[PDB]
Design a binder for this molecule. Structure first.
Ligand SMILES: Nc1nc2c(ncn2[C@@H]2O[C@@H]3COP(=O)(O)O[C@H]4[C@@H](O)[C@H](n5cnc6c(=O)[nH]c(N)nc65)O[C@@H]4COP(=O)(O)O[C@H]3[C@H]2O)c(=O)[nH]1
Ligand SMILES: Nc1nc2c(ncn2[C@@H]2O[C@@H]3COP(=O)(O)O[C@H]4[C@@H](O)[C@H](n5cnc6c(=O)[nH]c(N)nc65)O[C@@H]4COP(=O)(O)O[C@H]3[C@H]2O)c(=O)[nH]1
Ligand SMILES: Cc1cc2nc3c(=O)[nH]c(=O)nc-3n(C[C@H](O)[C@H](O)[C@H](O)COP(=O)(O)O)c2cc1C
Ligand SMILES: Cc1cc2nc3c(=O)[nH]c(=O)nc-3n(C[C@H](O)[C@H](O)[C@H](O)COP(=O)(O)O)c2cc1C
Ligand SMILES: [Ca+2]
Ligand SMILES: [Ca+2]
Ligand SMILES: [Ca+2]
Ligand SMILES: [Ca+2]
Lengths: 394, 392
């Protein structure tokens, strides 16, 4: 089946310039018998290629292209089935954009391509070509944020308690500063939140979730919570199904030597969106009391910015699923970059969670993320503050 | 009950400068007895004001401020309940940002206010860093524009179980019609609800699919030429027949249309409710060469995370985000993020439901170039309606 594949990449700046003549000649020669057509764009610093052909032919070729030493930061932009070849023709063409003025390069593309009966601008491939021509440097990863320039540099369990908590740091690597700690519930045997709640009767789960937080506050109070923030996780129902959950939390966090402004409630985006009715009175009370709110798991499931017209949280936590393979995904890059910007405009804090690799950290930072949470920096620490690994140069 | 209200605005650059010392002195003196506090930031062009007080007091005060001819382009950025007063003991106070070096204004703020973990503070910082971002440019002032009158030729067609009205999606910059949307109508010319209410509940998906034959017929006999055509379809209509896509292909071809010329609009909510099933249908549409749009984007709550799952050719911003976008910083921020994301992904964006020059001008300022609404063109029963263009 005819498939389209579009990616962008960049050259190595400190290495000799790539021989584009040898590249394009061997490309067009190899592509012809395999039925692979398209076009290569080059602006001096970045490549942008369109590839058309069978699914299996492009999968094979793109694997080789990903392994190629002549470029790096290969970012996939589009991959879809196609009704016709836009670049009919027997050879990989190259367009050196440095030789064209304002809109001469688009003019040049329409000499070797057709985009159906309607205006070319109605075609996604053409719009992507235009965007790279207009401003290809936008998602060009800066030199200082190249992963290769970076490298990475006790507590007891409490079985007698009906539940215990692990603390994971949210960090700001640019200031080597810990922003806050998230409390994650653990079972008496050190099990996961799934195991903990599975051991509780379905009819008592909401109440348990709320009441478990007294132990999270006690832990934070015993630890030097020196002006750091404490995030806790609650389901909407846990706050909702209680005559006064806000007052309950208030009394509990007050007793533990904490302040209202120091406690942030994380609620999953999926379960907040599904019950707008009940949530707003609870959210209001949380606000008036002075506690902060975060929208958790932002990007996972059903999760949008239109939510923000109804109410605006203090913080949004970008889900690990958008963080996964962000370095190779143009789609995730564009979404995360857009969320970051919207949050800046609205004065909402953004945290990228589930950060496991320097690649993720570098690319997340390139689109404006400054607060991070993940195994790269600090893993959850049962009943204590874990060690933090900071990225350092070389 | 304490409330916080924040807005940004702009001076009239052609008019004499306002005496801000007098304005602020009068403001501070009036505000404090009424239990109102806050600050005013000025960068030479724009104002940024924080107001704290009861819901009643800020409502009354903001109404006056909105009517004040000393400024324009008043955009509300925040209105929410507050736990405490940030500017206790300060009726009103102006910080002229041109009198400060980097972070000087912010540092002074902290000395008389009562930090990066507060939304008001982050907004203050954001205005100081890049206050001009959502400043409406001078050429895009509604006063610098005027809608011109265009005749339509609507016809009632008999021998049909349904009819279709056509509404143009336009690109005002190029005085160009991008596409026409087919909107189903009853045999008597009534609304979609009226049409579907006369069909048995169980026959609605089938009827929705089969009705598209008459939309293709209308487009074909228009003639459509090189223009695109939205139809609308529910996912269930597309699931109704095993080869619904195959049937659409035959019907559009017989009407003298091309696959790449036909675009299927599916509502945001109905797509996410079934990722299952939809992918097989989407696959067939792409292979056949028809295009897909996500309609009512921002109504199904909603957003850009769906783009990891598939990506449509087009998204159409829901009318709720369009409404009063000129006075809502929140809608402005959301619409701008959708525009920027879709631009990066090469997805066309249409602002739907545009009724005023104010909406059009502000949508244009956040990057939208394709528009659908009564401002430009109303739905025309079985025909191409008249189009109005804004002129400078
Ligand atoms: N793969 C990967 N994972 C990372 C990384 N960094 C952190 N994580 C983990 O991802 C989860 C983050 O919490 P969450 O997204 O709020 O998702 C949490 C949260 O929803 C939750 N949860 C935790 N405590 C509570 C609670 O007290 N009440 C409720 N309702 N839910 C809770 O259960 C979910 C699963 O929790 P956890 O087992 O604690 O697992 C944690 C955590 O340890 C990373 O770099 N890579
Ligand atoms: N206030 C205002 N309204 C504006 C403006 N511009 C356009 N509209 C209108 O908003 C609707 C736009 O179509 P929609 O969002 O798809 O919303 C449509 C669409 O969902 C729909 N529909 C139309 N045809 C079909 C169909 O064949 N099948 C299905 N399933 N739904 C259809 O029923 C809905 C109701 O459609 P309509 O009466 O045609 O109403 C149209 C339209 O006339 C404006 O500037 N201001
Ligand atoms: C920007 C870029 C574009 C490329 N395009 C193609 C191409 O279209 N066709 C191709 O066969 N190889 C292409 N390559 C080269 C492949 O990565 C790889 O070197 C080649 O397929 C190896 O096959 P060979 O040794 O049998 O010639 C490209 C490499 C880069 C850096
Ligand atoms: C940028 C801006 C900020 C203003 N802030 C206040 C204010 O905080 N308090 C106030 O009473 N009037 C404020 N005003 C003035 C009001 O719009 C209005 O002129 C005044 O409240 C009328 O009341 P008066 O008749 O007692 O003067 C502001 C005007 C502008 C242009
Ligand atoms: Ca969480
Ligand atoms: Ca998560
Ligand atoms: Ca529609
Ligand atoms: Ca709509």
């Amino acid at each position: 089946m005819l498939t389209t594949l579009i990616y962008r990449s960049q050259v190595h700046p400190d290495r000799p310039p790539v021989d584009l003549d040898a590249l394009v000649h061997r490309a067009s020669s190899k592509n012809l018998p395999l039925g692979i057509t398209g076009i290569l764009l080059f602006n001096g610093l970045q490549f942008f290629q369109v590839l058309e052909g069978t699914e299996e032919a492009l999968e094979s070729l793109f694997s080789e292209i990903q392994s190629d030493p002549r470029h790096r930061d290969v970012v996939e932009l589009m991959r879809d089935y196609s009704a016709y070849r836009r670049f009919h023709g027997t050879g990989m063409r190259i367009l050196d954009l440095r030789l064209f003025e304002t809109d001469g390069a688009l003019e040049e593309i329409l000499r070797f391509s057709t985009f159906g009966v309607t205006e070319p601008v109605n075609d996604r491939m053409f719009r992507l070509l235009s965007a790279f021509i207009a401003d290809g440097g936008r998602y060009c990863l800066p030199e200082p944020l190249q992963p290769s320039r970076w490298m990475m540099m006790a507590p007891q369990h409490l079985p007698g308690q009906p539940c215990q908590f692990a603390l994971q740091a949210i960090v700001e690597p640019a200031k080597k500063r810990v922003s806050s700690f998230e409390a994650l519930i653990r079972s008496p045997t050190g099990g996961s939140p799934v195991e903990m709640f599975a051991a509780i009767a379905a009819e008592d789960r909401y109440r348990f979730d709320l009441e478990s937080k007294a132990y999270a506050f006690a832990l934070a109070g015993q630890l030097p919570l020196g002006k750091h923030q404490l995030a806790i996780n609650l389901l909407p129902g846990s706050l909702y199904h209680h005559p006064d959950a806000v007052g309950w939390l208030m009394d509990s966090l007050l007793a533990a030597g904490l302040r209202p402004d120091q406690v942030l409630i994380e609620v999953t985006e999926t379960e907040v969106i599904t019950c707008f009715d009940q949530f707003r009175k609870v959210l209001k009370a949380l606000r008036v009391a002075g506690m902060k709110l975060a929208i958790d798991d932002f990007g996972a499931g059903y999760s949008g910015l239109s939510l923000l017209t109804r109410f605006q949280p203090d913080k949004i936590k970008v889900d690990a699923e958008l963080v996964r393979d962000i370095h190779i995904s143009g789609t995730k890059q564009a979404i995360v970059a857009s969320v970051v910007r919207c949050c800046e405009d609205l004065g909402i804090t953004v945290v990228a969670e589930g950060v496991e690799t320097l690649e993720e950290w570098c690319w997340l930072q390139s689109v404006g993320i400054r607060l991070f949470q993940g195994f790269l920096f600090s893993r959850p620490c049962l009943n204590g503050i874990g060690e933090i690994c900071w990225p350092v140069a070389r």
